[PDB]
Amino acid sequence: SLKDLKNRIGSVKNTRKITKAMQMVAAAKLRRAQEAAEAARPYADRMAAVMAGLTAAAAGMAPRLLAGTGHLLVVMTSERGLAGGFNSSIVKLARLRLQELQAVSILTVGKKGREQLKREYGDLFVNHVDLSRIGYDNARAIADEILDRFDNDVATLFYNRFESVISQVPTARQVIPAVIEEPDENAILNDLLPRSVATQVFAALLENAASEQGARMTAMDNATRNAGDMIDRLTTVYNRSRQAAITKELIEIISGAEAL
């Protein structure tokens, strides 16, 4: 029926205008996410410099628990979807590394992650749904809670690294215990180690957010093109039915007239 096709074309046409716009918004937000990352990069580089200096002169054995203990999986995902395989890829990396190593505890950051992992087998000790591009303050909270669980055996963090606007590489990083770059020394190392972990998490967050909006950029791009493709095929079928309705209505009118 033409009644349905009229509206079906309308819906796809409107929806395409949204997907088209959302590409443009995701494009804008990737810029601003990369701008803020150009501040976090040198900030973390300076911390890395000081950290590599202290570890060079870090007495032995006995050092500190946070630099060498003697599995907790942290998974960073979006809250909203429409980001292609952004969340799928990262959750596959988590599933893979867990299958190879343990034959655990999960910290789920973001709804898409928790959703997928809970449905599978949620070994979920802590969860986070962080409202606002959020700042360093929300990465400290997750760093302190995860340290609060390491205090009282190893924490690893999964996120999507940038390659390009098209490619976003899921990777894993070990966060606790920390790994070497390859007034006291011990007192300053006691505060920098928890504060370094904190910044890595925050770096991973910003990277993961810009990877999200790259993935969304190319996902909503494809949706727009697919909508135009559906709009053509629907219009061709609408016009068939439009012409058929006129043809058949006429035949009825004329067939009745010729019987008189």
Binding site: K111, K112, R114, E115, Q116, K118, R119
Partner: protein, 85 residues
Amino acid sequence: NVISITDGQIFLETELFFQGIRPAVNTGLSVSRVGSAAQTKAMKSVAGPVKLELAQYREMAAFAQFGSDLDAATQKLLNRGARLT
């Protein structure tokens, strides 16, 4: 024409038939214009709210397919709806 004559209709869809709902009655789109007046007291006492309940259930069921976390209240409604179905 015929729908506009009768005191209701039982509408069956191939979609439901094939997805396992047999008899393939679409509850929202089927209607009885006589209602509980055509039921015994007994049947009325149990079936009064079943149509509404199943309608709510179908809505919530589509919503849950978004994987999002569900409170105990939703989960119980889904559980009960799937069994009634």
